[PDB]
């Protein structure tokens, strides 16, 4: 409902269609003239136009055929997982089965094989054991009819059944063949021969013990080994491989990797059949973590009494675990150890004879590789934090400590050296062992440094997450709740565990007094038995579409990348949720853009209203040029290796068919809303289940809270974006074209705002040179320096009036985009564009809120982040609750997690979090300190206002003298000027000089200025400054100040002399304000476009 036009948007003819028609899910006016047909298919047919809309009809029919068949020759309706797998099965696709514990993969395999046998297509079912084969064939024979032809083979075979199998295999008289992995290994040739239209593998790792079996599988679905070798030759080289454009493969469906999918051969499945076979990962965790202040066995016995059945104790050493077992053996609890009688105690605990099992870390970790039954374990008890300890003596040298400390201290060399080498190097320069330890204390932050026993303790957070994760999984539908209890007295180790757990899993560990045990147990058991009612059908498939690959990686990092479909142009990850399956993919940028072909530079004019015409975007991966026109080579470097976006759209359409509900998670500004509307509009004639998300963080919390306020696409944001872009295209092209006649170059003016800023910078030079006054600086005895007007020579300052007061200095509000860009690019020696890239890299990596904001407002959650950090840091006295603003489009720039820069450094150097450079950490530090200083207590200060007399002139100075009560003073430092007595102060030196009273522009002051003047947006600032820079209108001198170039001065002079009315501030501000009003739906859209046109209509005449 924006009345625009998209170029590859017709679903039937594959051509161009309008906004209003794809919104109504219709083909173009050419394919179907009338507005309301009773049925698109038969209408397209009745007008000899039906073309690619056939595929969708055929799809839905031959899907619900599968559905009705499954419902008939089996129980009832499909579950979500089966619904998705079915929708992928009719399109002949291959994929691993992303699902949790026993959802009926074998059932789906049998049913699909049977349904395919109903056509003439032949399938093959592969199983890990030679016993499950028999069970499968049994459950199959009675399930089939007279029609189907099923067989099989194993080790304990019959007499004539063997030769029955061989003979029926010799001349293709089958539809279904059910054999073991043993058969795939042994009879490799026979399988390499045939071509199956369906290959089902129940156990992936059972077959992955031999590359021969991978190659055999690929040669089973119908791939020649020559292609296979020519792909192996590519993946071994490093890069990824594209397959033949029109090659028909068979269907391969497998389970998940029970273990580690090691090797490089598996990658073939990603390049030949377009699916990844990763290990099944589940971040689906519903757990309450509770900590108990000490290892008191009374508390242990009480808890054991409350939990009763399903308890698991983890000890650190085998000795204290032994002692613990000894203690618990006296209290008639049914406890079993794992260090002597293992299999008996495990297979007892597996059934229910034993109620409490005690294991050591490594023991259980390695010996559980067999089974690991989750339905029994409900409570996990830790007798001490699962940690990793290192020696802090000179010898017994840990390499990373030595590396860090030496790199900071004296003999820093390269990036890495041998262990004993660093040992011998630090055996020299260090002061003492004690000084070494102190250096480790100062340097290392985020770990525990026992300088008493010389021990470096680092909480094994991964171990803790697996072990804790034993108490909560997806069982028969419901994410059953669990309880993890830690007995840790060392407060530091607890703090470390808390921040690491909060970082990686976003999970709070609560204290004992805040935990109501009976309630927790009730929860646990209630959900547990609730997972037995067998409704097991809330399963849905979800699709989240984002425009940046980075958001996708950091989405996989908390949703859990299981498999990855190489879908055409894009890559789509799937994961397991509590409510089914989730699919998330990246767009890798914009999709459409204003074509430059027709009308007014692209915007056509029909029916008295303007209509933007969009076309798919193409980026050259070789040079970098972006273009709209549909061509074979790059219109700059003539390369065929171009990345198209219409491909991305086709992929998104097929994916759209395969899912249940679609959410579009583009960023929460106008730009994101446009990419959103392009996508939804293009997808709408495919599925009616599309909505918008607006994530303000990339975290589980951001995801959830954004899904809470899920809505449909807001059109005023779209209209605003379109008006903006149309202005930039119009004034841009026009002025650029006027300058093409005076300077020769064809790519100059990029808009009005850019030329306004150039106006400021260029006009600045003369007023900077102008207002250069002469000053003198005098430093006083028992006083600071003092800058006053020049030529004074009585050599004495006389205090006239004196007054002192006590005042509470509030802190500065949190960084908005302007504040952030300005003060960060000022403090660090960085340009605004690099700072913007950093902020974006921090937001998309889930470390801060939205970096594009014009509001200092902060949520109660953010305040609570401030409080949890102040509480952790030991200074929660100075916490304050300032929300700063009521009016806020978004929220200010704050961190999402109460973790400082140093702690993050530790996490990086260690290996928890990844992909952050020193600059990222510095910027994050700045945002952190700013935000905390915001939410910290006002500093109580004693300040004075001295009226001094110099050369008969009365000058007033005003200085903060005493900090009588601390506050945000610990984050953003505050200085004190020495006290001024009411006497005469002699002048020590009268330094006569001069500085210019109107300073030039830096990049920071440019952003600050166009913020003050209302000339720009949080998304335009750094784009503007960098536009001026890279297009050679501005240079940065020795003091990193912004000065105009000769080119710039000439250009702006031409602009001012010919077109001043169209470029000066007040017009840019008026249009900015007007467009803002358009965004809120206060100002008409077509009317403001009309305004822009009418004012461009006169620029064409000048
Ligand atoms: Zn059409
Ligand atoms: Zn190119």
Tab-separated table of C-alpha atoms in Angstrom, residues 1 27 66 108 370 420 422 633 718 862 914 1044 1056:
chain	number	residue	atom	x	y	z
A	1	UNK	CA	0.000	0.000	0.000
A	27	UNK	CA	0.268	-11.842	-10.560
A	66	UNK	CA	1.407	-36.770	1.212
A	108	UNK	CA	8.617	-40.645	8.465
A	370	UNK	CA	27.438	-44.497	25.720
A	420	UNK	CA	60.327	-22.801	27.961
A	422	UNK	CA	59.192	-17.413	27.572
A	633	UNK	CA	29.293	-8.587	-16.764
A	718	UNK	CA	8.580	2.982	4.308
A	862	UNK	CA	19.578	-1.322	31.599
A	914	UNK	CA	35.527	-14.139	19.603
A	1044	UNK	CA	38.429	22.322	2.826
A	1056	UNK	CA	26.573	29.401	-3.502
